[PDB]
């Protein structure tokens, strides 16, 4: 739990948008990631501070299909320690993953989702979505944005669920290539 513990403290923040409470992973410097349906926009609340969003990029694939990820550049002096090195180069499943959740309503919470498998296509609330992975755990509302970790790796971001299963958007280190 050392990794998940250090990642929560250094990198994972309680967040609010117009869509409600979400978990947010700071990736490096002022770059952070959120589930697309959180619709950050121009501003978000990070730990009850109203922050300006300088940039928001919604990840889609070459065909323009939703990946349910939104990269945000925050207007803050605070820098996140670089965790891109814990993000695998290709979207990979895992064994015994821990879903890390951190919102005002569900603070500092570890969820034993278990195995994480390649899933692919998912119709998330009527929206076609690609590159998703799945875990057989009854995830619930308010857990979106949750960080899926396994053996020192950050493999996904929780985005949805169907009652008995949880889904995350796969994480590639390539998403975070510098400019």
């Amino acid at each position: 739990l050392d990794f998940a513990l250090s990642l929560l403290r250094r990198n994972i923040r309680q967040v609010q948008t117009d869509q409600g409470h979400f978990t947010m992973l700071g990736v490096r410097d002022r770059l952070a990631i959120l589930p697309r349906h959180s619709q950050p926009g121009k501003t978000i609340w990070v730990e009850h501070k109203l922050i300006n969003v300088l940039d928001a990029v919604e990840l889609v694939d070459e065909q323009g299909v939703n990946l349910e990820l939104t990269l945000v550049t925050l207007d803050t002096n605070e820098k996140f320690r670089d965790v891109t090195k814990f993000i695998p180069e290709t979207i990979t499943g895992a064994s015994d993953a821990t879903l890390i959740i951190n919102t005002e309503h569900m603070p500092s919470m570890f969820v034993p989702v278990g195995d994480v498998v390649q899933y692919g296509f998912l119709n998330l609330s009527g929206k076609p979505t690609h590159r998703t992975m799945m875990y057989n755990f009854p995830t619930k509302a308010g857990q979106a944005g949750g960080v899926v970790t396994s053996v020192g790796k950050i493999i996904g971001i929780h985005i949805g669920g169907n009652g008995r299963q949880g889904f995350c958007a796969g994480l590639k280190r390539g998403y975070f290539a510098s400019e």
């Binding site: 119709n123 998330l124 609330s125 995830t139 619930k140 509302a141 857990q143 929780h158 949805g160 169907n162």
Partner: peptide, 8 residues
């Protein structure tokens, strides 16, 4: 009715 889920 497969491959379905809702945002959470």
């Amino acid at each position: 009715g497969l491959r379905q889920a809702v945002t959470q």
